[PDB]
């Protein structure tokens, strides 16, 4: 966690609702964005820290 690893997502479309509808995730939060509104929104790049 002092030197976290980054993955890039670009040039594609997705369903984000799986990130809380899946039983695999114990907790989910969003900041500056709404959990439903993810499926309507767009971004220049997505980085997973």
């Amino acid at each position: 966690v002092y030197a976290w690893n980054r993955k890039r997502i670009s040039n594609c479309v997705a369903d984000y609702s799986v990130l809380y509808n899946s039983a695999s995730f114990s907790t989910f939060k969003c900041y500056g964005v709404s959990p439903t509104k993810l499926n309507d929104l767009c971004f220049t790049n997505v980085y997973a820290d």
């Binding site: 809380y20 509808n21 989910f28 959990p35």
Partner: protein, 48 residues
């Protein structure tokens, strides 16, 4: 803790509308049924 506000609702209040109910919320896809995750109590206290 005797002062409170409603933090959770499905729709905004109309002009001079008011709401007494303590019915349990559903902030996400939990099958809530009045009982936990997304199942929030609708009021919060200020606790001044």
């Amino acid at each position: 803790y005797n002062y409170l506000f409603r933090l959770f609702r499905k729709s905004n209040l109309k002009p001079f509308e008011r709401d007494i109910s303590t019915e349990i919320y559903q902030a996400g896809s939990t099958p809530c049924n009045g009982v936990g995750f997304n199942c929030y109590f609708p009021l919060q206290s200020y606790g001044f």
